[PDB]
Write a protein that binds this ligand. Structure first.
Ligand SMILES: Nc1nc2c([nH]c(=O)n2[C@@H]2O[C@H](COP(=O)(O)OP(=O)(O)OP(=O)(O)O)[C@@H](O)[C@H]2O)c(=O)[nH]1
Ligand SMILES: [Ca+2]
Ligand SMILES: [Ca+2]
Ligand SMILES: [Ca+2]
Ligand code: NA
Length: 326
DNA sequence: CGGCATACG
DNA sequence: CGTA
DNA sequence: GCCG
């Protein structure tokens, strides 16, 4: 019926079980806030299964045979089908622990571990953090200062103007270098919390040393509100009607030999990529990352000229980015 | 039961 | 530890 | 939490 790995099935951005998937993803998120990566994965995968279905789930019977639905996830769906609400999910939603971990981890520079420590220390609100700035890293100070802007979704309409600014700086840094939009926008999203760009050059090796040159030029243009190599996680100044707003932008450089692997990895979704790497390793005996695909028996790397090549070498039907919304 | 993606900053 |  |  439906295969067990999310990389084996198309997953569109919009689907027929939105409410059920959102409920499961609350439990997934809450598991992650408690450090239970296994439970987070199962709830994420069960949610993703529903996203891949061709029609709404109406009755519990329709979960029989679907992968990743056991007693717990099935009970969640059952309660939503019978009452429109799942008591467990609602308890999580209104819990002080969930709400505060959510608010803290949403800060750029704050992960689960930091948020958990703050929570145990008694901290609960953004103003609690602002009042004791001595415990904050420079990254976290920037994420806290910019938090309101960064909490607002970026529009696909904003992205093109920003891509052109990046292209101009990239072209000065290295003529002929290219900029490719990746992340959720490449999967078709009309909004997102940040913009992702992948940079390369058609002559292998010319990209060496490129990212610092790009960042220096963007900084000289006054566009960088914050930046800390081949990956840069920045906060950019983006024009707005009569003003501007802070936006998170990630820049990545890859040599053209690795570009298909980097494009695949940075286009996501996060669950899709984890499932693809898991499939590669556990079903095909091959090790996948954003740089390449390694056969550990022959000790050789697969040359890829396209994403299509990578799917073929893993024995998977090709999925365009818009069907990778696992 | 073991496993749960895999890097870089 | 943070980030993707 | 679930799969194999
Ligand atoms: N956020 C995130 N992305 C990750 C991780 N690991 C990983 O490979 N990625 C890759 O990085 C890509 C871009 O990260 P992102 O957070 O901007 O993802 P996105 O564009 O779908 O999210 P957004 O729509 O909220 O902007 C993901 O789609 C995914 O392929 C991870 O742990 N977290
Ligand atoms: Ca089952
Ligand atoms: Ca993004
Ligand atoms: Ca990103
Ligand atoms: Na964070």
């Amino acid at each position: 019926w439906m295969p067990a790995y999310a990389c084996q099935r198309p997953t569109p951005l919009t689907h027929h079980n939105t409410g059920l998937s959102e409920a499961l993803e609350i439990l997934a998120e809450a598991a992650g806030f408690e450090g239970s990566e296994g439970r987070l994965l199962t709830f994420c995968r069960a949610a993703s299964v529903l996203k891949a279905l061709p029609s709404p789930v109406t009755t519990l019977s329709q979960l029989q045979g679907l992968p990743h639905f056991g007693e717990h996830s099935s009970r969640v769906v059952q309660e939503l089908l019978e009452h429109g609400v799942c008591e467990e999910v609602e308890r999580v939603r209104r819990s002080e622990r969930y709400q505060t971990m959510k608010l803290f981890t949403q800060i750029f520079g704050v992960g689960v571990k930091t948020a958990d420590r703050w929570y145990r220390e008694g901290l609960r609100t953004l103003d609690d953090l602002r009042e004791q700035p001595q415990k904050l890293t420079q990254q976290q100070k920037a994420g806290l200062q910019h938090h309101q802007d960064l909490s607002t979704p970026v529009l696909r309409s904003d992205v093109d103007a920003l891509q052109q600014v990046v292209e101009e700086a990239v072209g000065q840094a290295l003529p002929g270098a290219t900029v490719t939009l990746t992340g959720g926008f490449r999967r078709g999203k009309l909004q997102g919390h940040d913009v992702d760009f992948l940079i390369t050059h058609p002559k292998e090796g010319q990209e060496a040393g490129l990212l610092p040159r790009v960042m220096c030029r963007l900084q000289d243009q006054g566009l960088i509100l914050y930046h800390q190599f081949e990956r840069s996680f920045c906060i950019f100044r983006l024009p707005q009607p009569g003003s501007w707003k802070a936006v998170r932008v990630d820049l990545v450089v890859a040599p053209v030999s690795q570009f298909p692997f980097a494009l695949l990895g940075w286009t996501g979704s996060k669950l899709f990529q984890r499932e693809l790497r898991r499939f590669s390793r556990k079903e095909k005996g091959l090790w996948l990352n954003s740089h390449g695909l390694f056969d550990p028996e022959q000790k050789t790397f697969f040359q890829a000229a396209s994403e299509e090549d990578i799917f073929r070498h893993l024995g998977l039907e090709y999925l365009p980015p818009e069907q990778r919304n696992a």
